[PDB]
Design a protein around this ligand. Structure first.
Ligand SMILES: C#Cc1cccc(/N=C2/NC(=O)/C(=C/C(=O)O)S2)c1
Ligand SMILES: [Zn+2]
Ligand SMILES: [Zn+2]
Ligand SMILES: [Zn+2]
Ligand SMILES: [Zn+2]
Lengths: 193, 192, 190, 195
């Protein structure tokens, strides 16, 4: 029973935003609005903005989970390849198997689901900082889309769910992700289609 | 399904609403064209009671929500799990109840023993010196959009006037949308 | 305290136009350019034309509001008499000015001034036509005891953006009477 | 200074801008004054800008548009939409709501909030002229009026069109003044009668 990817703004008007970073040679993470697709480098900072019409209560949580986009691969759990799992890159909080990490958050929590065996990373919701109208989470993707014995060129979605302290669903959104050496070049190439 | 049929009855019982318009700042606004209240979560929703003649002593006013659509009508309207557990409690209303009355310490809440439907009842008070109607302040404690609650399904509120024994004196109804921007949503919905 | 009646064509060159109806016995509404005054019958169609040099943006709105013309009555809210206050399903019973034939009409009791107004979306002229026509109804006679009671009123037509920011304003005096043709002719002979 | 350069540069490919000879008739939604080097256009309406080159730039060449204030005392201020227009819904799903300059009819359009200057710009791939045609046309939309309180607020702006290679190296730059107004025909005629 593949986890739901259906968009749901729900009670708090929950949407995702991304920086308008462009496709310049130097860019480590870039979002294509035309493709609803993030292009990012391995282990590099991937800002995802949370936008709400109304402030969820304290103890609201934000979960990230990867699934395969293709229907024939969707029941397979998205995990790191053997090679990246054994690279000495653990930050002491993230399980070595987990594709998606959060950086800069000491309250981050990781789940190996007892029944689905799917991986996810959860942080407390904090309201926007002074200056901002959105909340930024810094994701790291710890395997390349190309990795043999991992994703192996199969496209993935990230599903961002907003939940209350009791685990009740408040909101859900999703975006395609490609983890690659040259996000700028790969975004430009994929858009020319 | 409880009756929604309009009935002015013996005392000429009608509902009135503030003529608030659709300015960005408006927290609650009524569309006469749609017979539909647009209001924000937990915010004051004035409903006016108009009578041609003063109902008898011990007259009561009940509010009850039903789903508007025929395929959802037998389902009891309640809060979503999330809002049921949230600290938005006045100490009087059951946590499950969508419709509260604010500013009335004589308010009474019912879980109907047989229908399991929720309702909130207040004593009828005649208009204040100067005024021609009685205002009740309703709060809707879930958004129309709430996942695992109304979940975008439209609802009606039914306002019934009853005597002290619970005999029907009068009934009216209006559609409700609980939303972030009532002004914008009323304007948008009227454009159709 | 009192809403502004100062004419303002503003950015879009906003002016009012009226049908050149004359003063024949049969006429239900007639405008005097010499007096800038509409003479109309109770509840009858009052065409008001909106003329613009440039098309205002989508979500532009048109508000109508009545005030008393005389300085000693200007702070009093214009409303219907008790009798007429006692059919259309949309307009509050107290409101003097209604719009007919528009399902998108919106009515306001101002929270702070207690002044009444009616607002419709601006629609551009049809291709070929030069103006937009709104059909107003006045729901009380100028003569009504316990209402306007023979006091003259102005209608103020404001053009506003979707946020309620003023784009344009015009005004015209209104007399609601049994015989607009006769009353216009009589008032002009002065 | 901080301010991005507005200096004209035809550079290696002989890069210059052209505009339609549209005139000042009542109906005209965008009109260019050669005497003033100034585009007069209506909000959200199609603004053709022609790219002329002496020699075809390589594939992966890009064309960026950016607005700056013309006056030296306002030049370090970022040109953006007013609060009012930023919140208006008419959005194409691609352009940030804050961006004054959009490109229409181009699904390969890319928008930049510069991480360090905070300046906005819109980029499209350079395509050579079609069989028959002698120049490349881009369709710009300006999403705020020159008059807008809490935006440009009657301050004149320049649009800077830069030609860059795939690596972001500058190939060419040109500029033109822009007025976004209700009546471009009338406003061009009025502004030209001054001299
Ligand atoms: C033609 C045209 C066009 C396109 C986009 C924006 C615009 N100005 C606007 N001004 C407003 O206040 C409205 C707000 C809203 O988008 O509803 S849109 C005009
Ligand atoms: Zn790997
Ligand atoms: Zn809820
Ligand atoms: Zn009257
Ligand atoms: Zn603006």
């Amino acid at each position: 029973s593949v986890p739901s990817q259906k968009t749901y703004q729900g009670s708090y008007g929950f949407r995702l935003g991304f920086l308008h970073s462009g496709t310049a040679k130097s860019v480590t993470c870039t979002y294509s609005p035309a493709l609803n697709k993030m292009f990012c480098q391995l282990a590099k900072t991937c800002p995802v903005q949370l936008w709400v019409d109304s402030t969820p209560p304290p103890g609201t949580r934000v979960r990230a989970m990867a699934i395969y986009k293709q229907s024939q691969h969707m029941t397979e759990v998205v995990r790191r390849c053997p090679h990246h799992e054994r690279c000495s890159d653990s930050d002491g909080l993230a399980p070595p198997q987990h594709l998606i990490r959060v950086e800069g958050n000491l309250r981050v929590e990781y789940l190996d689901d007892r029944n689905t065996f799917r991986h996810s990373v959860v942080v407390p919701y904090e309201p926007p900082e002074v200056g901002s109208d959105c909340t930024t989470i810094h994701y790291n993707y710890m395997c390349n889309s190309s990795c043999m014995g991992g994703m192996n060129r199969r496209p993935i979605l990230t599903i961002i769910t907003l939940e209350d302290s009791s685990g009740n669903l408040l909101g859900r959104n999703s975006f395609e992700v490609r983890v690659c050496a040259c996000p700028g070049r790969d975004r430009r190439t994929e858009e020319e289609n």
